[PDB]
Amino acid sequence: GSRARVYAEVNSLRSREYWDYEAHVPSWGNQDDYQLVRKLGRGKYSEVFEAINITNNERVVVKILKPVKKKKIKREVKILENLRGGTNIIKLIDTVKDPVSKTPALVFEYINNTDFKQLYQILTDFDIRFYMYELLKALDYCHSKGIMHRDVKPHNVMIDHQQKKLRLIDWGLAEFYHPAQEYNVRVASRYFKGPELLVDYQMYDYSLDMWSLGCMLASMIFRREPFFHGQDNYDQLVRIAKVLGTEELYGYLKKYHIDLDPHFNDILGQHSRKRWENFIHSENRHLVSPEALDLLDKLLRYDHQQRLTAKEAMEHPYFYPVVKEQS
Ligand SMILES: Brc1cc2[nH]nnc2nc1Br
Ligand SMILES: [Cl-]
Ligand SMILES: [Cl-]
Numbered sequence: 001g002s003r004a005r006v007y008a009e010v011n012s013l014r015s016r017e018y019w020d021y022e023a024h025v026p027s028w029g030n031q032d033d034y035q036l037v038r039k040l041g042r043g044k045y046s047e048v049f050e051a052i053n054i055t056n057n058e059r060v061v062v063k064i065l066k067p068v069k070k071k072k073i074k075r076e077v078k079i080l081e082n083l084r085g086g087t088n089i090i091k092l093i094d095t096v097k098d099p100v101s102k103t104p105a106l107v108f109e110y111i112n113n114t115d116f117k118q119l120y121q122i123l124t125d126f127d128i129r130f131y132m133y134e135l136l137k138a139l140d141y142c143h144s145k146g147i148m149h150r151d152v153k154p155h156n157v158m159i160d161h162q163q164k165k166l167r168l169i170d171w172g173l174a175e176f177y178h179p180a181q182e183y184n185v186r187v188a189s190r191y192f193k194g195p196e197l198l199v200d201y202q203m204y205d206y207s208l209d210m211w212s213l214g215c216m217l218a219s220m221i222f223r224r225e226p227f228f229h230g231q232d233n234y235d236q237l238v239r240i241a242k243v244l245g246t247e248e249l250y251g252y253l254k255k256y257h258i259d260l261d262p263h264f265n266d267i268l269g270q271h272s273r274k275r276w277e278n279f280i281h282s283e284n285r286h287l288v289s290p291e292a293l294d295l296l297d298k299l300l301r302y303d304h305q306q307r308l309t310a311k312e313a314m315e316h317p318y319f320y321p322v323v324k325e326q327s
């Protein structure tokens with residue numbers, strides 16, 4: 001079967017307690033120290049608030065969890081505690097419970113983010129390189145810690161464009177990578193799902209996040225957000241195949257012995273692989289360079305095992321201007 005080219009055995013080389021999140025026993029502090037100020041968002045299993053820690057007057061974010069999902073709560077807590085101190089990973093400050101109802105909540109550092117729909121319209125060439133480099137640091141870190149994020153998308157990459165701070169958030173879908181483990185493919189936002197998920201290939205790895213990152217890079221340099229805009233999960237693969245080509249898709253499926261849902265027969269059609277230069281026009285030409293296209297071409301590949309790792313991406317010439325400035 002398939003396995004990760006990097007970090008494959010990292011969890012098996014650690015203590016079982018590192019990855020055995022079902023056995024994790026969080027230390028639950030008291031939510032009464034936090035005053036909710038404003039609702040920021042809501043999801044299937046959580047609600048998120050700006051809040052003040054009344055004991056030190058610090059602004060924080062509080063994510064209240066539906067208490068029923070106990071295994072999933074332990075998973076997210078253990079992952080966040082394993083990632084503590086990681087570069088550009090949102091900092092978990094506290095794990096707390098309502099002292100009466102025992103409903104759990106996660107307390108995070110606050111970040112004053114610029115909404116990505118507004119931000120992505122004004123980014124410069126250097127800004128894209130800079131923020132992509134910072135996001136890659138977060139993914140290289142979590143991958144090196146044996147963790148797949150599985151929900152990389154603009155909404156989960158919080159950017160304070162005034163202070164130049166980036167944090168990868170929402171670790172509620174993240175999982176530990178173990179070689180040969182078969183994972184649930186119902187992860188990531190539709191537009192950021194790797195082809196492996198869309199063809200029901202369960203033996204995926206950290207390289208899933210690299211597809212999602214490539215999708216973000218393409219949306220930022222080309223100013224088409226989201227870049228692959230499917231109407232459902234079937235159409236999502238069609239949108240990908242329109243660009244990467246159908247014959248290349250079939251070679252991928254053959255290599256991994258992947259059976260294709262026969263509903264694809266009536267919708268995939270026949271598509272050449274397109275040159276990435278086809279996406280350039282006057283509105284995006286200043287964000288596109290040969291080095292951007294070379295990097296993107298090495299991320300948005302069907303074959304998950306041939307996509308760049310986060311580290312290989314960081315090492316690409318596209319980021320040399322950022323590395324030099326950070327000197
Ligand atoms: Br900070 C922060 C952390 C999160 N984790 N999951 N959702 C989140 N939202 C915000 Br805002
Ligand atoms: Cl899973
Ligand atoms: Cl297209």
Ligand code: NA
Binds near residue numbers: 031032033034
């Ligand atoms: Na409280």
